Every structure is written in C-alpha cells, then in structure tokens.
Design a protein around this ligand. Structure first.
Ligand code: HEM
Ligand SMILES: C[C@]12CCC(=O)C=C1CC[C@@H]1[C@@H]2CC[C@]2(C)C(=O)CC[C@@H]12
Length: 452
C-alpha cells in the first residue's frame, strides 16, 4: 500500500508540518491533513513520525489492542504540567499507568457512580438557587462558569470532599488546562526562551499549590479520622496506597489533581454545547421534557431513572457526535504492526480524528444534528465518543450519568434561550487538543426562564 502524506524535504517536511500544528492548533491541523490527503496519513510533530487517522477500522484496531495503550507529547511540556509519568491521562510509562489506572477506574464506577447521580443533582440545585452569582443585569447567565463550578463541586464532594474555594479553583483549573494545552506539543527550543513559556509554569504552580493545601488537609483528617471504612473516596484510596508504599506522594498528588479537573475541563464544555443545541432545536426539547415527566415527574432523580431516559441518552450521544469537545485521541504504537495494510513501527505517534470519523462513516445523516442518526442502535465500533478497551475514557460511564443528571435537573426547572442570533455552528471555536468555545469572543451567555 505505502503511506500517504506531505513530502519529506530533508528537515523541511517535518518543519512545515509541525509549524502547521502550532499555527492552526491540533484539532484543525488534523482535519486539514485528513481532508487534503487520505483518512490514513503520515505527518511529523517534533522529530517523530506521527499518523493521523479517521478510518473507523484503524481506530477500532488501535483502541482494542494493549500495544497502543500509550499517548505522547513534549517530555518537557509534560514535565512542566506534571503529567510526565505521573497521572494517568498522559502517563506514558506503561508500568506506572497500569498500576495507577485501577484507582481511577474503581472510583468512577459501582457505588460511586450511584452516589454521583444524586450528588450532581444536589450540587446543581444548590447553584441554581444561587443564580445571582452568574447572571447578568439583562438576565444573561454565564453557563460556562456555572457548569464549571458545579462540575468541580461534584468532583470534590465525590472524590476528595475537602472544603475549597469553588470560584478561585475553577479559574486556576481553567489556567492549568490552558497550560497543558499549550505546552503539549511545543518543540524543545520553546523551553529556552523563558519570558515566553513561564506564563504557563505559573498557572501550573497556582493550581498545584492550591491543591497541595487541600491534599494537606485530607492527610490530616485521615491520620486520625473515624476508622477508615466509611466510604473510601478516591483521595483516601490513593493516600492509603501511598502509605503502604504502593504509590509516591508526587503521583498521588497529581492523580487527585487529574481527577478534579477532568469533569470541569470537559463536561462543562460538552453540556454547554448541548444546552446550545437544545435551544435551537425545539421539537427535541419537548421530547426530553415529556420523557422527564413520564419517567421522573416531580420526583427526585435516582439511579433507576437513568436507563429509561432513552430520548435524552440519544440526544447526548448525537450532541457529542455532532459537536464533539473531545474530537481527537492521542495514542502511541508500542509494538510493530500492520494497521489496515500499513506498516507501523513502534514509537510511531498516532492521532485518532474521531470527530471527522463521526462524519465520514456509518451515520445516515452525518452532517446535521438529528436523533435520526441514533434511531437504530449504534454498533460502537462505529461510534467512539469516549474510546474503549485498555485505555478508553475512565469516566465514560460516570459521565453519561452526570450529564443525564444535570440536564434533567436543569431542563426540569428552566427553558433555555440562545442569545438572539447565536447557535453552536456560529460560535468562535478554538480547535486544538479539545474543541472548546473561544472565550475571548462573547455572546456565549444564555437566558434561563422558568417552565411554568
Ligand atoms: C463528558 C465528556 C467526556 C468525554 C467526551 C471524554 C472522552 C475521553 C476520551 C476520548 C478519552 C481518550 C481515551 C482513549 O485513549 O481511548 C478520555 C480519556 C480519559 N478520560 Fe474521559 N471523557 C469525558 C469525561 C470524563 C470524566 C468526567 C472523567 C473523570 C471524572 C474522565 C476521565 C478520563 C481519564 C482519566 C482519561 C485518561 C484515560 C487513560 O489514558 O488512562 N473523562 N476521555
Ligand atoms: C478527556 C481529557 C482528560 C480529562 C481532562 O481533564 C480533560 C480532557 C480533555 C482533553 C482530552 C483528555 C484525555 C486524553 C485526550 C482524549 C487526548 O488524547 C487528546 C485530548 C485529550
């Protein structure tokens, strides 16, 4: 077959291509190349060869096998954000990731997934009763900040539960993600011109220190406590492993940070896009309101309710399909392999353009938002919003629950209006790492009006 992509020009090929990624941003850079060349094609970030693939069959082969259970990134960029062989998200040491992941997996399923449905609802209730902290004079709600605040609140009360400053931390987290996003594929030259990179080294330290205060108190509380087996929360589980010397304090500290940011980083942006889609799609809103009245009514939301919320479940999926936030997945080849009739050496970086994949394959009406796409049960080998197998999203289950929870408890109480002209398609979007809205532009607010 042989491998498609731009020409090697001795040092130039890898320089224009890396440049293209730094200029446009990973998201749009990937779409570019996919659109120009094949759905399977080669590029260069830093020195290293990297493939950018939207072929559903390649995606499936890659996520399924254990020998793609790695990601990649600037070592110096990762060391800076403290993800270099520490958390799980970009922990690329196979032996440390293999031993760390279990803690996340356990915390994000079973009993904790059941509490989460009832804790998302409470934390949103408490914040909808406090709308005065996010609403404009002309009645504009800052949906983004609201969603981040609750998300953080939920994550905290479930995984750490130490009193913190919601408002402050959300900003710090917001900065950290920006740092993470920037430094992730910066070439090494970047890390010499300091009055250029240490804008970020700041955001990182600010969050890292803010948390070191919380993990400090959680340690104090544990040392004395109430004899352990209350509900072993993520944070405890970790500290006790650290205490048995299964983990190092550095590792534990990063893990907690990674858990607290994951929700606000992605859920808020996802739900924000969803609320924007609900506004501009009135017939769908009725469907969801009916389904709510049928299944839940005026009752509190409980775990048993969530399986029956099928219309909503299909809205949620169709939203992530049509307007993804996490539209690309970074992986690394650990062994030699033929991948859809292509030679893939170990050490080859991979970007899985799962956003473009949800447009080009399977779906009846791939290029418009309709629950038509999910009218017939979807194979999942054709639809990967979270990924799967050894290294798929750790919260892939708890997320789906949380979104149902907070959508119900919102749409229950409020009709949601988009600002005059606005819709998701006409929003300034940064397409790099994640696909989030441009927050320097504006009219990203919404109007909450009661249902009755
Ligand atoms: C709701 C929107 C979310 C989306 C679309 C999403 C999607 C993804 C995707 C596509 C990956 C890449 C997995 C792979 O390599 O196949 C991932 C990784 C991950 N996600 Fe999610 N996720 C979401 C929410 C969450 C939440 C709420 C949490 C935790 C509370 C979470 C925790 C993680 C972690 C820890 C990883 C790294 C897994 C690893 O490499 O070990 N995600 N996510
Ligand atoms: C879901 C996630 C982790 C939790 C978090 O804090 C925020 C994000 C957003 C970016 C995701 C990332 C997981 C790894 C992903 C899928 C990649 O390989 C490229 C983009 C990136």
């Amino acid at each position: 077959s042989s491998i498609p992509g731009p020409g090697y020009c001795m040092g130039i090929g890898p320089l224009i291509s890396h440049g293209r990624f730094l200029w446009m941003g990973i998201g749009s850079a990937c779409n570019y190349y996919n659109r120009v060349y094949g759905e399977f094609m080669r590029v260069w970030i830093s020195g290293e060869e990297t493939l950018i693939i939207s072929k559903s069959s390649s995606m499936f082969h890659i996520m399924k096998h254990n020998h793609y259970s790695s990601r990649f990134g600037s070592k110096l960029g990762l060391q800076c954000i403290g993800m270099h062989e520490k958390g799980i998200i970009f922990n690329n040491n196979p032996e440390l990731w293999k031993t760390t992941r279990p803690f996340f997996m356990k915390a994000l399923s079973g009993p904790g997934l059941v509490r989460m449905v009832t804790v998302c609802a409470e934390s949103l209730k408490t914040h909808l009763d406090r709308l005065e902290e996010v609403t404009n004079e002309s009645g504009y709600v800052d949906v983004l900040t609201l969603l981040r605040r609750v998300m953080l609140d939920t994550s905290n009360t479930l995984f750490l539960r130490i009193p913190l400053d919601e408002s402050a931390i959300v900003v710090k987290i917001q900065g950290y993600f920006d740092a993470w996003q920037a430094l992730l594929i910066k070439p090494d030259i970047f890390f010499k011109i300091s009055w250029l990179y240490k804008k970020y080294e700041k955001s990182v330290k600010d969050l890292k220190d803010a948390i070191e205060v919380l993990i400090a108190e959680k340690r104090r509380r544990i040392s004395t406590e109430e004899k352990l087996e209350e509900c072993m929360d993520f944070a405890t589980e970790l500290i006790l492993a650290e205490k048995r010397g299964d983990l190092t304090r550095e590792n534990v500290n990063q893990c907690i940070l990674e858990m607290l940011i994951a929700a606000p980083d992605t859920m808020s942006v996802s739900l924000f896009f969803m609320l924007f889609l609900i506004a501009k799609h009135p017939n769908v809103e009725e469907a969801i309101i009916k389904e709510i009245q049928t299944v839940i009514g005026e009752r509190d939301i409980k775990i048993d309710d969530i399986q029956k919320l099928k219309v909503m479940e299909n809205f949620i999926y169709e939203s992530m399909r049509y307007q993804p936030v996490v539209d690309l997945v970074m992986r690394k080849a650990l062994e030699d392999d033929v991948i859809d009739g292509y030679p893939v050496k170990k050490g080859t970086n991979i970007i899985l353009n799962i956003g473009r994949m949800h447009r080009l394959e399977f779906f009846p009406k791939p290029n418009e938002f309709t629950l038509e796409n999910f009218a017939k049960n979807v194979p999942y080998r054709y639809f990967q919003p979270f990924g799967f197998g050894p290294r798929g999203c750790a919260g892939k289950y708890i997320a789906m629950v949380m979104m149902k929870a907070i959508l119900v408890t919102l749409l229950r109480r409020f009709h949601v209006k988009t600002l005059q002209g606005q819709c998701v398609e006409s929003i300034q979007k940064i397409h790099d790492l994640s696909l989030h809205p441009d927050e320097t532009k504006n009219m990203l607010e919404m109007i909450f009006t009661p249902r009755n």
